[PDB]
Design a protein around this ligand. Structure first.
Ligand SMILES: *[C@@H]1O[C@H](CO)[C@@H](O)[C@H](O)[C@H]1NC(C)=O
Lengths: 138, 97, 206
């Protein structure tokens, strides 16, 4: 398996997800920096540096987007699952291994959950993409 | 926690609608002068539309309401009661038909 | 004849995949059921597909043309989908040769948008311009067909292999005629289908 091809497919998948989030009009207008209280469980500006941090961040975003009842978020969650599997395949390269208030915010504020989740996901993916050019540590 | 008065408003184009909100920040109600309003977390509503009902109850008035443009599954506009830069997750549902 | 071919096609938005297969060789054999089975591999397709023991049934709908259509939604763009047809007879079961399809490689892109066509009279060239579709993100190749607008368009085709080309200049024989232009695109690596022709674009003349 050509690792260069895996990295290229990872970059292409990240760009695809970023474009999908860009196409959702009501998400680009929301500032990912402007903090929202009550949604601190959604990885805001954590300095993503390790492979395990990327994996846990994407797993959190996956679990959050799974609860939303839209088909766009379901598709983004599946794409994130593929991205996570690609990250595990990239982790197996450099020979290194990797290891409930949500219900209330989904029931009361679905719009806030979706908007903040998608804005944080877009920011995290742009950071991962920009950091993929530099060889990342395990 | 935040409380909206009223929790939801259903109205038609051209009508006026007002929302009241209470912001209890970490066990203390902030001053109504500190409360700012946001629309769908996208744009701050002009302060001209704000009205200080009392020291704790803030009010926002919408005039000549335009038909709410639906954003995918969301056919309503999410009105937010915020404590300056820090907004809350709970919003008010404004339906304009 | 259990040699049934299954063809899958991913929509231009990469939101669903529709697979088609004909039961033309099994309709005569009644008293037994025929259903599509599939298995998903975390990443990519194996070099030689195999009938995995663990699979799940997919609900397919019979169409007016006699083919069954099974729609997968949502999809896993980079997951390998191994699928085959299983016939469950009272005497046992028979399986068609399995095939593995990668949804990323069977994407049918949307046609190029914002297609413009202009004739620069200073040079006498037909300048065509377009905007690539939102998806896919991979490098694309373009094909331009152009002709004089009339009763029966006499099409001419031009191939563009420059992935970063957003325009093409074609030398036409009649500079005072109105031309109609349509553009379609396909993945540069050829792993996919050609898009539909874009909405017609027309030039001006004065
Ligand atoms: C609604 O607000 C406008 C804003 O100027 C005002 O002119 C109008 O009288 C209001 N309507 C009612 C019924 O209060």
């Amino acid at each position: 398996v050509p690792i260069q091809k895996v990295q290229d497919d990872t970059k292409t998948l990240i760009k695809t997800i970023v474009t999908r989030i860009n196409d959702i009009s009501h998400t680009q207008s929301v500032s990912a920096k402007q903090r929202v209280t009550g949604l601190d469980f959604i990885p805001g500006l954590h300095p993503i540096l390790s492979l395990s941090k990327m994996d846990q961040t994407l797993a959190v975003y996956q679990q959050v987007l799974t609860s939303l009842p839209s088909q766009n978020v379901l598709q983004i969650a599946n794409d994130l699952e593929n991205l996570r599997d690609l990250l595990h395949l990239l982790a197996f390269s450099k020979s290194c291994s990797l290891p409930e208030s949500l219900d209330g915010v989904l029931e009361a504020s679905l719009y806030s959950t979706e908007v903040v989740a998608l804005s944080r996901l877009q920011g995290s993916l742009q950071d991962i993409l920009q950091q993929l050019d530099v060889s990342p540590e395990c | 926690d935040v409380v909206y008065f009223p929790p939801k408003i259903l109205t038609s184009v051209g009508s006026n609608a007002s929302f009241h909100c209470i912001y209890k920040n970490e066990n203390q109600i902030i001053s109504s002068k500190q409360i700012v309003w946001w629309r769908n977390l996208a744009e701050k509503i002009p302060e001209i539309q704000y009205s200080i009902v009392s020291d704790r109850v803030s009010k926002v008035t919408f005039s000549n309401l335009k038909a709410t443009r639906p954003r995918g599954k969301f056919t309503y506009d999410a009105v937010y009661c915020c404590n300056e830069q820090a907004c809350h997750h709970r919003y008010a549902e404004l339906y304009v038909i």
